[PDB]
């Protein structure tokens, strides 16, 4: 059944049916054995598409709600629809965070895996923080920060500075500082230091992953340039 569920997931992916792809990978995770690298990446892609559709729609509607200030009926419709999108978004992050807490994080037996799932834990708390307001927002921001910080410690201690997971973590944690903590100096510092450490050790690139590494380096620098300018 395991190998079957993964096949169905890749078929779903080809078909661009990400709900199906995510359901298959959720079933696999719940069987309880660590995921191989391939399975972990399938799970990540599946849920990024499922959640990202709602995040994209939420930004659009939230921009509309903001533009219809002073047109009460329109702004109320946008507000109610934004609320509906948020409940979906929350249900999806709650699902992922439940998988990470029950299965992925506690069975992770290698540093690389631990970092990957703690980053993902930080990402999905960050998504919950994007649509949190008022009372619970502080605790959600705190859970995002504590997952990224743990990943960040482990990755500096165990991973080469050109490792794509280490670089992707720096990219997303710096965004978390910029957008969630409204701390651009801190976000710029984190991104510039990851870029600089990777430049210093280009001999640690490997044939297998240099394309992912050099791409993330470019994105870190693009964020720095967006944020300096």
């Amino acid at each position: 059944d395991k190998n079957e569920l993964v096949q169905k997931a890749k078929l779903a992916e080809q078909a661009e049916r990400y709900d199906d792809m995510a359901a298959c990978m959720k079933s696999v995770t719940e069987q309880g054995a660590e995921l191989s690298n391939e399975e972990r990446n399938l799970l990540s892609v599946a849920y990024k598409n499922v959640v990202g559709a709602r995040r994209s729609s939420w930004r659009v509607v939230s921009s509309i709600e903001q533009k219809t200030e002073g047109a009460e009926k329109k702004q109320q419709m946008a507000r109610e629809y934004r609320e509906k999108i948020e409940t979906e978004l929350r249900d999806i992050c709650n699902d992922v965070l439940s998988l990470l807490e029950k299965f992925l994080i506690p069975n992770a037996s290698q540093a690389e895996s631990k970092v990957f799932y703690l980053k993902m834990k930080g990402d999905y708390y960050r998504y919950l923080a994007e649509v949190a307001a008022g009372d619970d927002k502080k605790g959600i921001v705190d859970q995002s920060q504590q997952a990224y910080q743990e990943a960040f410690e482990i990755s500096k201690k165990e991973m080469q500075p050109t490792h794509p997971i280490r670089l992707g973590l720096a990219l997303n944690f710096s965004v978390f500082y910029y957008e969630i903590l409204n701390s651009p100096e801190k976000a710029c510092s984190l991104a510039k230091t990851a870029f600089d450490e990777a430049i210093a050790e280009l001999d640690t690139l490997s044939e297998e992953s240099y394309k992912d590494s050099t791409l993330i380096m470019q994105l870190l620098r693009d964020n720095l340039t967006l944020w300096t300018s």
Partner: peptide, 11 residues
């Protein structure tokens, strides 16, 4: 132009 995070929906 938006700030980047990874994973993205597309790629």
């Amino acid at each position: 132009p938006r700030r980047n995070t990874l994973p993205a929906m597309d790629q």
